Design a protein around this ligand. Structure first.
Ligand code: NI
Length: 705
């Protein structure tokens, strides 16, 4: 009795990213979360990140106020190189270096996060997880939507969502979703701008055939802040006892950051008969990114600035309140092609129904990089003292910076052309022997890479041949409860080159998981719980005898517990929440050991509830609020310090405008970080910290014609 209510809960019972076949969640031997469009329409997340805020095992706020990338640390791990591990329609948006693409949630139908290894279905993947977003597709019913937004920091957004049929039978239908957005970043001097249009076309010749054309085009002149701040002035006080304000910007006044995304593809499915169904997913993208960025590199008293001349030239007591800075000029262009073709075979074997999945997955990525990086003494220092109480009154931008006149003395060129290719064949079978579901499959991958260093004129190459498999069982009851357990593997090639001049071997993921899923078919509620043991082997570590080169053989373990709960407690009260316990540890490592990797808290939790009024004069009025708890975490591999825990509160007030005639329409007021709490999201190192997001206020008016 309100879109995001039970209608959403039940819709989220079905998924496919976990088995590549339309399977209900209780029948999936792995942890998986689903966030629906209605849910996002209610919460109004800035990015896909926040859209998953009430899901377990994911730090979505790591980078704080920045919104340049949808980077997620899942189950304590991230992809090789901190690259996103994000999918769109079952196909990976393979990026490289600063070239990673994002999809605005307004263009999504839903998001799904899969925890733990999943190479068994998608190939090389970081252990810990994978995010899969689904594009909005043309609707059966007509849709004419216009949305207007006005908020803090000068947030102004205008968009539309129109979908309709061309024939009265619906063999031909389309959808066009677009948005225009602009605002000022939390940091002074930084802006954000976004232009996005998503043309979609569906073709249903009959009811056993579906060809949907999916395209997305996005232009971002300015992506906003993406800087680094010292733990000194953020997590810790400056020598003067004060701190840098949350809106502090240490980059140049002329720092610039842009991204361009263009993609065309399609989703296809055809049911031949009662036993055979074929579905193919294909996409091609050409994405670009450029930037001129002056970034922070810790205070002068930071070990990382020992060799800094401008830093040594200071009084020993001053080293700790002056900021070392560097810079980068980047320009990249990449093309990414993907096709996944799968044949699904349904058939029984004497009381044993089988769903046999067999398919071939292919992708090739090419990224050409032309950048320049400033080293020590490449850019002026900054006294962090001026940023006093007065600036907690206003902000104060910095000065320009010549991004040209690349001084060969303090800066240098970086020109790389990376290539990636991966062909994989996989087989999976979902066998149900009444109340017993056994998932088991495997995949073999051909992941070859090749890197050309235009500046050094050298070429590094490697072809990995890998195998991964997964097996699990879901004892499906009838009262609801659904116990399960499973084993899964993942592999991920390295791109780093050792002292021998070769590309390291791939790292591997191994996970053992057990838990029960309560998915009652008679009540709009879902509850999941799970405990797991995830291990990443062949992690690159420091050379036992300092050599600038890494060594493999390292190992890291993450064991934990995740509980997620979504339910409609009444006709006007909906609640969603989770709790996560993560015990991440360096098992084998030269410099570390027993240490927990940075940015991953031991405890995380969130809870959300909303109330809708179908009574008196407050009919159609929705009130909602939630809390997100982020435990304390370490701010560097050495665990030399720690970032504090925090709890952010969000709230909204929605009024079903469908009481002034305008039905389907509504007005809403969203406030994030209600108590305007000041916190440090996290730090990846002593010189890389991020202020959290300061209280935001947004007014949204979405009209349905
Ligand atoms: Ni080729």
């Amino acid at each position: 009795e309100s879109a995001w209510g039970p209608a959403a809960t039940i819709a989220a019972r079905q998924s496919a990213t976990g088995t590549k076949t339309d399977t209900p969640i209780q029948k999936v031997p792995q942890s998986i979360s689903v966030v629906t469009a209605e849910e996002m329409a209610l919460h109004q997340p800035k990015s896909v990140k926040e859209a998953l805020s009430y899901t377990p095992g994911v730090s979505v706020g790591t980078r704080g106020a920045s919104n340049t990338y949808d980077h997620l640390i899942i189950r304590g791990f991230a992809a090789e190189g901190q690259s996103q591990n994000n999918y769109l329609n079952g196909l990976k948006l393979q990026g490289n270096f600063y070239n990673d693409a994002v999809i605005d949630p307004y263009m999504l139908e839903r998001a799904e996060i899969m925890r733990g290894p999943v190479s068994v279905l998608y190939g090389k993947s970081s252990p810990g997880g994978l995010l899969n977003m689904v594009s909005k597709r043309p609707t059966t019913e007509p849709l004419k939507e216009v949305q207007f937004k006005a908020g803090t920091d000068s947030l102004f957004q205008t968009g539309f969502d129109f979908s309709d049929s061309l024939d009265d039978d619906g063999v031909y239908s389309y959808r066009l979703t677009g948005l225009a957005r602009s605002a000022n970043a939390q940091q002074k001097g930084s802006e954000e701008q976004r232009y996005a249009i998503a043309p979609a076309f569906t073709w249903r010749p009959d009811d056993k055939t579906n060809f949907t054309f999916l395209s997305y085009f996005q232009n971002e002149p300015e992506t906003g802040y993406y800087g680094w701040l010292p733990k000194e002035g953020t997590v810790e006080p400056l020598p003067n006892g004060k701190r840098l304000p949350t809106d502090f910007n240490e980059g140049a006044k002329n720092n610039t950051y842009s991204r361009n995304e263009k993609m065309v593809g399609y989703s296809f499915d055809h049911e031949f008969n009662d036993t055979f169904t074929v579905r193919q997913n294909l996409r091609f993208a050409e994405n670009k990114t450029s930037q001129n960025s002056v970034y922070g590199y810790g205070v002068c008293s930071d070990p990382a600035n020992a060799y800094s001349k401008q830093c040594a030239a200071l009084a020993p007591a001053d080293k700790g309140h002056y900021l070392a800075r560097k810079y980068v000029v980047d320009d990249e262009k990449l093309q990414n092609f993907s096709v996944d073709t799968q044949l699904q075979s349904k058939f029984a074997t004497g009381d044993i129904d089988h769903t046999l999945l067999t398919g071939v997955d292919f992708m090739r990525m090419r990224n050409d990089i032309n950048a320049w990086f400033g080293y020590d003494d490449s850019v002026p220092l900054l006294n962090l003292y001026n940023p006093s109480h007065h600036h907690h009154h206003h902000g104060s931008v910095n000065t320009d910076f010549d991004f040209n006149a690349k001084d060969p003395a303090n800066s240098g060129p970086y020109r790389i052309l990376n290539k990636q290719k991966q062909t994989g064949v996989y087989v999976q079978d979902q066998a149900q022997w009444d109340k017993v579901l056994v998932t088991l499959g495997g995949r073999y991958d051909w992941a070859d890479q090749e890197s050309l260093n235009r500046v050094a004129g050298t070429t590094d190459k490697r072809d990995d041949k890998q195998f991964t498999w997964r097996g699990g069982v879901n004892y499906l009851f009838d009262n609801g409860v659904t116990p399960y357990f499973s084993y899964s593997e993942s592999f991920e090639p390295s791109s780093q080159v050792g002292k021998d001049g070769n590309i390291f071997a791939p790292s591997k993921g191994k996970q053992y998981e057990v838990g029960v899923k309560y998915v009652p078919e008679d009540r709009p509620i879902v509850v999941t719980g799970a405990v797991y043991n995830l291990t990443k082997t062949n992690n690159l570590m420091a050379d036992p005898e300092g050599s600038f080169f890494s060594v493999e053989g390292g190992e890291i373990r993450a064991r934990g517990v995740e509980i997620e709960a979504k339910a409609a407690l009444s006709a006007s009260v909906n609640v969603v929440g989770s709790y996560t316990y993560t015990d991440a540890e360096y098992t084998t490592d030269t410099t570390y050991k027993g240490n927990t990797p940075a940015q991953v808290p031991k405890h995380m939790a969130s809870l959300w509830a909303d109330y809708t009024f179908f009574d008196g004069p407050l009919s159609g009025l929705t009130l909602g609020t939630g809390g997100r708890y982020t435990g304390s975490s370490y701010g560097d591999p050495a665990n030399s310090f720690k970032v504090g825990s925090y709890t952010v509160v969000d709230a909204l007030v929605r009024y079903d405008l469908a009481r002034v005639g305008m039905a389907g329409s509504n007005v809403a007021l969203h406030v994030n970080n209600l108590f305007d709490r000041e916190y440090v999201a996290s730090c990846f190192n002593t010189y890389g910290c991020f202020w959290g997001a300061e209280r935001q206020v947004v007014a949204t008016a979405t009209f349905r014609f």
